[PDB]
């Protein structure tokens, strides 16, 4: 059945159309040196409103890939959003859907903070501490990638995890910019990813275009590391299933587990059939996701969760254990094997 369902979904002669009357903003590569400034003036000043930081990160992505490539990416993502270009005025940027009041506020706040830290201090600002640093857009996109790995999770868990992991992953940027509010920027990125779902596809295309590069700075290598940490998002049950098989859990040989193993292997075969893009299904909110669910094998899922709980892997996972006896037996065996 599962192969037939995927065959129906894949073999479609008709293309969906959505967001027909909508538009979005991009910034041409000719403005990259400008957007960098903006992407850094968000980082070293303490701003009251961090509402469009995610849009500025996506603007930098658009400068990197190019306006035409970004339009093509949005078009092939199933969304008929018409790209609107970015202009300059007196210079500053007039990004579509980003209020000019916001851009002026961010610029003025950063200029005032820079003046205050230059007047009082000894005037020895290093090359990495200024807003026009060239890795500041990647530093903002690193907060974006941290909150990207938690798009399958909830908002509160995502924000808490982003802040916790960014105090260590982004320690160097925090030292360079003492006053960068990872919570508010992470909230902005979560809002962008939820509202504009095609920007998940744009962000993934940037991740690919960055990982495929021949050279990169440490900021881009960090961004790619986090982006790849997001790969199996929304499918931790499959990873824990292969973990359970590697652990040689005895309760995998139970009668009901052996009964469901056929369709479990069917799900894994479907994973292989989709191939490399299967991992990005839940990150993209591809409607095709959910063909990879193991919820139709309650006993296998309970055994997998029990094995994970025994090994300590389960952590604070919020999934359901359908069959509690199998869960407890698997947990006991996994603890025994671990000890």
Which residue number, 10 or 175, has a Cβ lying nearer to RNA?
Answer: 175
Give Rg (Cα) of the chain.
Answer: 23
Query: Using CB under 7 A, which of the segments 32-40, 53-61, 157-165, 182-190 binds RNA?
Result: 157-165
Window 315-334: contact mask with RNA (x via CB under 7 A): xxxxxx--------------
With vertex at residue 136, the alpha carbon angle to CA 132 and CA 137, rounded to the nearest 5 degrees, is 110
* Shortest Å distance, C-beta 61 to a second copy: 12
Checking DSSP bridges between strand 87-89 and strand 92-94, what pairing results, if any? antiparallel
Query: Can residue 164 be called a binding residue for a second copy (CB under 8 A)?
Result: yes
295 binds RNA (CB under 7 A): yes
Q: Is 54 buried (19+), middle (13-18) or exposed (0-12) by CB count in 10 A?
A: buried
Q: Is 293 in the site for a second copy (CB under 8 A)?
A: yes
47 vs 196, beta carbon nearer a second copy:
196
DSSP, collapsed to helix, strand or coil, labels residue 122 as coil
Considering only 26, 140, 146, 204, the residue that binds RNA (CB under 7 A) is: 146
- Say how far apart CA 288 and CA 14 lie, in whole Å: 15
Distance CA 59, CA 54 (A): 8
Looking at 43-51, 71-79, 104-112, 144-152, which segment touches a second copy (CB under 8 A)? 71-79
* Segment lying near a second copy (by CB under 8 A), choices 44-52, 90-98, 142-150, 220-228: 220-228
- Choose one: 102-110, 174-182, 184-192, 252-260; the region binding a second copy (CB under 8 A): 252-260
Q: Can you list the alpha helix ranges (DSSP code H) found in 66-217?
A: 67-76, 100-119, 136-148, 155-169, 171-176, 182-195, 198-211
**Residue 169 binds to RNA (criterion: CB under 7 A):** yes
The binder of 315, among a second copy, RNA, none, by C-beta within 5 to 8 A per type, is RNA
Cα 216–chain centre separation: 20
89 binds a second copy (CB under 8 A): no
Contact between 124 and a second copy per CB under 8 A: no
Q: Does 172 bind RNA (CB under 7 A)?
A: yes
Asked if 218 is part of the footprint of RNA (rule: CB under 7 A), the reply reads: yes
Report in angstroms how near the CB of residue 115 gets to a second copy at its nearest: 25
CA distance 185 to 53: 6
3-class secondary structure, 221: helix
- Neighbouring residues of 263: CB distance < 8 A, sequence distance ≥ 6: 2, 296, 297
Question: Is residue 302 near a second copy by the rule CB under 8 A?
Answer: no
- Please check whether residue 199 is in contact with residue 62, taking contact to mean a CB–CB distance below 8 angstroms: no
Taking CB under 7 A as the criterion, the residue among 10, 100, 108, 164 binding RNA is: 164
With CB under 8 A, what is the number of residues at the site for a second copy?
A: 89
One residue of 38, 282, 309, 331 binding RNA per CB under 7 A: 282
């Amino acid at each position: 059945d599962l192969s037939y369902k995927h065959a129906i979904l894949k073999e479609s002669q008709y293309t969906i159309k959505r967001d027909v009357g909508t538009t979005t903003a991009v910034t041409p590569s000719s403005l990259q040196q400008e957007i960098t400034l903006l992407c850094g003036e968000i980082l070293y000043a303490k701003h009251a409103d961090y509402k469009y930081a995610a849009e500025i990160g996506i603007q930098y992505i658009s400068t990197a890939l190019g306006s035409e490539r970004v339009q093509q990416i949005l078009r092939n993502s199933g969304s008929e959003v018409q790209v609107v270009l970015t202009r300059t005025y007196s210079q500053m940027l007039d990004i579509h859907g980003v209020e000019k009041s916001w851009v002026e506020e961010i610029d003025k706040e950063a200029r005032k903070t820079m003046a205050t830290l230059l007047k009082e201090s000894s005037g020895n600002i290093p090359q990495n501490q200024r807003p026009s640093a060239p890795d500041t857009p990647i530093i903002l996109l690193c907060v974006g990638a941290l909150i990207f790995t938690k798009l399958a999770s909830t908002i509160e868990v995502g924000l808490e995890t982003t802040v916790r992991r960014a105090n260590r992953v982004l320690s160097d940027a925090l030292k360079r910019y003492p006053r960068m509010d990872i919570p508010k920027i992470a909230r902005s990125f979560y809002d962008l990813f939820e509202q504009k779902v095609y920007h998940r596809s744009l962000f993934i295309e940037y991740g690919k275009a960055l990982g495929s590069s021949s050279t990169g700075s440490k900021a881009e290598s960090l961004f790619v590391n986090i982006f790849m940490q997001a790969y199996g998002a929304g499918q931790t049950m499959l990873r824990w299933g292969v973990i359970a098989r590697s652990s040689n859990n005895i309760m995998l040989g139970h009668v009901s587990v052996q009964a469901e193993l056929k369709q479990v292997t069917e799900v894994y075969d479907l994973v292989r059939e989709m191939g490399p893009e299967s991992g990005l299904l839940h990150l993209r909110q591809s409607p095709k996701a959910g063909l990879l669910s193991l919820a139709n094998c309650p006993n296998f899922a309970s055994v997998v969760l029990g094995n994970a709980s025994g090994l300590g892997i389960i952590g604070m996972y919020r999934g359901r254990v359908p069959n509690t006896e199998l869960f407890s037996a698997a947990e006991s065996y996994a603890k025994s094997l671990k000890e």
